[PDB]
């Protein structure tokens, strides 16, 4: 009841390739750091290595796509639509304020959606920030993610 289509695997591969920026089929700690840093975080090497370690099933020190797919498909099978949105909001609400600033979310979107144009990201943010106060709060994020 939790089969994967070709298109689903390609979507998980797009998420994998966000991190595997050199395209050699593995995610290294440096590549993970490049993404996290682009989001304004500053993970340490030990923190990056621990993150790799959670997904690296064969222990060779990097994440390959079968490891990534295993983790992502299991997460998808185990988490409902409302729960996964809730958790994703808390990932991007770094200080736990209940808000993501419009400027922060724009930067997140530009870096995670690499082929988006500025016009497209602008439209997404304008739609997300329902009341236009320059912040995307929790319920605004839920509603943007459920539409």
């Amino acid at each position: 009841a939790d089969q994967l289509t070709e298109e689903q695997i390609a979507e998980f591969k797009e998420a994998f390739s966000l991190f595997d920026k050199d395209g050699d089929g593995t995610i290294t700690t440096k590549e993970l750091g490049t993404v996290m840093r682009s989001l304004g975080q500053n993970p340490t090497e030990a923190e990056l290595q621990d993150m790799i370690n959670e997904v690296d099933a064969d222990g060779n020190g990097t994440i390959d796509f079968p490891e990534f797919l295993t983790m992502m498909a299991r997460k998808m099978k185990d988490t409902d639509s409302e729960e996964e949105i809730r958790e994703a909001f808390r990932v991007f609400d770094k200080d736990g304020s209940g808000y993501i600033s419009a400027a922060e979310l724009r930067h997140v979107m530009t870096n995670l959606g690499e082929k988006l144009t500025d016009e497209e990201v602008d439209e997404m943010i304008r739609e997300a920030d329902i009341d236009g106060d320059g912040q995307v709060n929790y319920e605004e994020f839920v509603q943007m993610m459920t539409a």
């Binding site: 797009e14 958790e87 988006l116 993610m145």
Partner: peptide, 26 residues
């Protein structure tokens, strides 16, 4: 838990991009 969540949130945001492009067109 935390690590899985970070990777999965990226996918969920990419999924939102896909749906947004579909709604903008149709």
């Amino acid at each position: 838990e935390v690590t899985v969540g970070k990777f999965y949130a990226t996918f969920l945001i990419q999924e939102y991009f896909r749906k947004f492009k579909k709604r903008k067109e149709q």
